[PDB]
Amino acid sequence: TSKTYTIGVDRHVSVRLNHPYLFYNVIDNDVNSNAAINGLTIEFAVGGRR
Amino acid sequence: MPDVQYPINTYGWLKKAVALWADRDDDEFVNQIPNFINFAEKEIYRNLRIPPLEKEVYLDIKDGVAYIPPDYLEAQWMMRAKDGTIFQVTSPEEISYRRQHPVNFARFGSRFIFYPSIEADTPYYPDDGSPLIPAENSVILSYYADPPEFHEDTDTSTILTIAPELLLYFTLRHACLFVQDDNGVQKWSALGKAILDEMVEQNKKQEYSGSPIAIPNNMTRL
Amino acid sequence: MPDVQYPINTYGWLKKAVALWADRDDDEFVNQIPNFINFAEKEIYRNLRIPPLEKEVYLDIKDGVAYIPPDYLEAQWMMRAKDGTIFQVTSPEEISYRRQHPVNFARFGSRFIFYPSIEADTPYYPDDGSPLIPAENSVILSYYADPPEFHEDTDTSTILTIAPELLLYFTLRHACLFVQDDNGVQKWSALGKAILDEMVEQNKKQEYSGSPIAIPNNMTRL
Numbered sequence: 001t002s003k004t005y006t007i008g009v010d011r012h013v014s015v016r017l018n019h020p021y022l023f024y025n026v027i028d029n030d031v032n033s034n035a036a037i038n039g040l041t042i043e044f045a046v047g048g049r050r
Numbered sequence: 051m052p053d054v055q056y057p058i059n060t061y062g063w064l065k066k067a068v069a070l071w072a073d074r075d076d077d078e079f080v081n082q083i084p085n086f087i088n089f090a091e092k093e094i095y096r097n098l099r100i101p102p103l104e105k106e107v108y109l110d111i112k113d114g115v116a117y118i119p120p121d122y123l124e125a126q127w128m129m130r131a132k133d134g135t136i137f138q139v140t141s142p143e144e145i146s147y148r149r150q151h152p153v154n155f156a157r158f159g160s161r162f163i164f165y166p167s168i169e170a171d172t173p174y175y176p177d178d179g180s181p182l183i184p185a186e187n188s189v190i191l192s193y194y195a196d197p198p199e200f201h202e203d204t205d206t207s208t209i210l211t212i213a214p215e216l217l218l219y220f221t222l223r224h225a226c227l228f229v230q231d232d233n234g235v236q237k238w239s240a241l242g243k244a245i246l247d248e249m250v251e252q253n254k255k256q257e258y259s260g261s262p263i264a265i266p267n268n269m270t271r272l
Numbered sequence: 273m274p275d276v277q278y279p280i281n282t283y284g285w286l287k288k289a290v291a292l293w294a295d296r297d298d299d300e301f302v303n304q305i306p307n308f309i310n311f312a313e314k315e316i317y318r319n320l321r322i323p324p325l326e327k328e329v330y331l332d333i334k335d336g337v338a339y340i341p342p343d344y345l346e347a348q349w350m351m352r353a354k355d356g357t358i359f360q361v362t363s364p365e366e367i368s369y370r371r372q373h374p375v376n377f378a379r380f381g382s383r384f385i386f387y388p389s390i391e392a393d394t395p396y397y398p399d400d401g402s403p404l405i406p407a408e409n410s411v412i413l414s415y416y417a418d419p420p421e422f423h424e425d426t427d428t429s430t431i432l433t434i435a436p437e438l439l440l441y442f443t444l445r446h447a448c449l450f451v452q453d454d455n456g457v458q459k460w461s462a463l464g465k466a467i468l469d470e471m472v473e474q475n476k477k478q479e480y481s482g483s484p485i486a487i488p489n490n491m492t493r494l
Contacts, residue, residue: 014076018295047453084278139482
């Protein structure tokens with residue numbers, strides 16, 4: 001999946017996965033941006049294993 | 051992200067309000083909104099019964115075979131327009147006896163049987179008009195019918211005119227199922243049920259209601 | 273990753289919607305999707321009983337007997353095309369007697385028996401090929417039938433048109449078995465069972481619905 005995060009408007013990003021090894025990219029393409037990230041917080045659960 | 055009106059008339063807005071409540075709209079989720087809804091309305095109608103979905107309808111008997119309409123779920127009273135007269139229902143094992151040796155009827159698969167070879171009538175299918183002036187000998191049915199699944203944003207149903215929060219919660223249910231937030235599930239579900247039972251109780255207090263009842267004491271002519 | 277329409281109607285889409293509602297999407301899992309589905313439909317049909325899977329059918333009594341259909345699961349009324357005259361059922365330990373000293377039929381392995389030693393004939397069938405000139409002497413049976421396993425993508429069944437979420441959860445069950453996310457198992461299973469009971473009750477509030485029953489006083493002449 002991929003989504004825009006637009007500050008002041010959005011507080012989170014909905015991504016559906018279940019694989020045991022996640023990755024993420026953050027991209028900032030935009031011209032009029034001076035934003036920054038202090039940190040994340042990833043919401044998750046647990047399934048199982050085969 | 052989205053927005054809505056004060057009243058949520060319908061799908062076109064509801065499918066957004068759901069995204070709103072239930073926290074998120076990320077496309078993997080929205081595009082199944084409709085599915086969640088198709089689930090919820092079904093989980094409801096499977097057992098909900100009230101007037102607003104009822105139906106009047108005339109039948110074409112042909113001495114028996116009178117066939118069951120597709121839309122049928124459950125039958126309340128059934129009668130004639132002529133003189134006012136109520137049927138009652140029984141099993142094959144009895145109507146068959148009535149054959150060998152009041153009006154009864156029964157459910158043979160997709161067929162309705164009536165002991166006496168009745169002949170209520172409808173115009174034949176290709177039709178042309180419908181006024182019919184109900185053929186003297188017409189019987190009319192009162193039955194709960196399967197409502198239509200939504201298929202359009204500006205579609206609608208009484209439910210939203212009256213009790214939309216219900217659908218909202220109950221579909222949030224299957225949503226919080228899609229993605230694992232079960233506490234929310236419990237809450238949504240309890241609230242759906244507690245909203246719902248109110249309705250049936252409304253109806254119960256409606257029925258037999260306007261005043262005290264009393265056993266008729268029917269005693270025939272002798 | 274996959275995507276689906278709103279109004280799930282085909283095994284073809286279902287096979288993907290499952291892969292969806294569960295995060296993990298891999299060949300160790302999809303390629304056995306169908307097995308899970310088989311398991312679920314079997315677990316259901318094993319004890320579910322309702323009209324839509326019922327069947328009308330004529331028999332081929334040769335002499336007081338007849339062989340049972342491959343597709344048979346469970347029986348409801350049988351009788352004659354004419355006069356009704358419902359049969360009832362009993363054990364050999366009685367019917368054999370009734371031979372020594374209404375109608376009675378019983379089950380001997382793959383065979384049906386009838387005491388009065390009947391003869392029915394399955395229809396005349398074909399020729400020009402317009403109808404199935406049914407045979408006088410015909411008895412007709414109503415029995416729940418083993419539905420066909422899909423074994424095809426576009427294939428469908430009444431169910432999906434009706435209650436797909438059911439199949440969905442119930443197969444997710446065996447899925448969450450393949451890989452050990454049990455709590456999800458519990459959830460799926462509970463919901464499947466709830467749905468199912470809703471259904472059976474939809475049917476129960478049907479099968480007697482019309483009007484107050486009233487126990488017949490069937491008394492033979494004298």
